[PDB]
């Protein structure tokens, strides 16, 4: 399934991950270290899922699971505060 996935697409998926976790219109947030840490995390996650998945659907599924978890954590902590 790797033969049908391009570098461009992977990059875009990373970006989609980032935006789904922390949607930000701002430009000055993208220059902040925490944001950079998020992008880095996303790249790592995407890599791990690309390595692990045995199909495109599985890949998407795993990425989605990870996004969901991060979102849930974030929501929980927001409610806590």
């Amino acid at each position: 399934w790797h033969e049908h996935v391009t570098q461009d697409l992977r990059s875009h998926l990373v970006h989609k991950l980032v935006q789904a976790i922390f949607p930000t219109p701002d430009p000055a947030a993208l220059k902040d270290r925490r944001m950079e840490n998020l992008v880095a995390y996303a790249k790592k996650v995407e890599g791990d899922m690309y390595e692990s998945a045995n199909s495109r659907d599985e890949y998407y599924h795993l990425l989605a699971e990870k996004i969901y978890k991060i979102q849930k954590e974030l929501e929980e902590k927001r409610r806590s505060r």
């Binding site: 391009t6 461009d8 697409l9 875009h12 998926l13 789904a20 599924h61 989605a64 969901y68």
Partner: peptide, 25 residues
Amino acid sequence: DPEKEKRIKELELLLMSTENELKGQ
């Protein structure tokens, strides 16, 4: 955790829509 499956599918869809976004003409 109940609506988890729903959201997961939503996220899957969102991610898949990234394929058909990339094109020229």
